[PDB]
Design a binder for this molecule. Structure first.
Ligand SMILES: *Cc1c(COP(=O)(O)O)cnc(C)c1O
Length: 217
């Protein structure tokens, strides 16, 4: 039924939205089945779990891997080696480090900046004013491609609160784009299994769906 859930979900998305199939807590065989249904973008929250899966998927030539979880400095080199996108960039120090590493490795990861717009004790994220302050410095990084913002809803929001959070993410990104015209801030990484339709309606370009596609762990 992975193939059926994928087709059902894709039929609903406009061309502007790409789906990331979030395979965290599912094995390589799940990913293989999604791929046979035409899925190419997969998301993981742990670097080592993705490294292991990648070693079991040598049959898949054209995967794009997205890192969705908190990235500490001790996994930064592996992150840059093994992921195409890193959505969870939540600080200047991390951004600067990824940029130096990417230089040394000859890679150019595509990054989203993970921004905290509402209180959430479960997730890290940039303070909006801290992010406005660092934009000149982020603008000058040469070895990463900063492409957008990532926003994750605090647990237990209502539909209406979620809808307003995603709208706020859209408007904040536009404000940053105006303040940093060097940045190609074209993306909004938002929406998961329960709220992706709200995210799409407010301008998401990447949605991140796990459970609705793969079922539970
Ligand atoms: C777990 C997770 C997802 C997928 O969540 P579902 O509710 O299973 O769709 C997407 N993005 C991030 C950052 C996650 O941690």
């Amino acid at each position: 039924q992975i193939a059926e859930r994928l087709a059902s979900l894709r039929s609903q998305l406009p061309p502007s939205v790409q789906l990331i199939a979030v395979s965290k807590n599912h094995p390589a065989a799940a990913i293989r089945e999604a791929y046979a249904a035409g899925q190419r973008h997969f998301g993981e929250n742990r670097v080592q779990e993705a490294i292991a899966k990648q070693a079991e998927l040598t049959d898949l030539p054209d995967l794009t891997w997205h890192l969705l979880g908190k990235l500490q400095s001790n996994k930064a080199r592996k992150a840059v080696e093994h992921f195409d996108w890193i959505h969870s960039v939540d600080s200047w120090a991390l951004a600067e480090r990824l940029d130096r590493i990417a230089g040394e490795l000859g890679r150019s990861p595509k990054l989203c900046l993970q921004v905290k717009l509402l209180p959430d004790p479960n997730k890290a994220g940039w303070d909006p004013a801290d992010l406005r302050a660092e934009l000149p410095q982020l603008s000058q990084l040469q070895q990463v491609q900063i492409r957008g913002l990532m926003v994750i809803a605090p647990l237990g929001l209502t539909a209406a609160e979620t809808q307003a959070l995603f709208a706020q993410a859209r408007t904040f990104a536009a404000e940053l784009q105006q303040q940093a015209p060097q940045l190609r801030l074209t993306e909004l990484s938002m929406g998961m299994s329960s709220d992706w339709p709200l995210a799409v309606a407010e301008g998401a370009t990447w949605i991140r769906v796990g459970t609705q596609l793969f079922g539970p762990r």
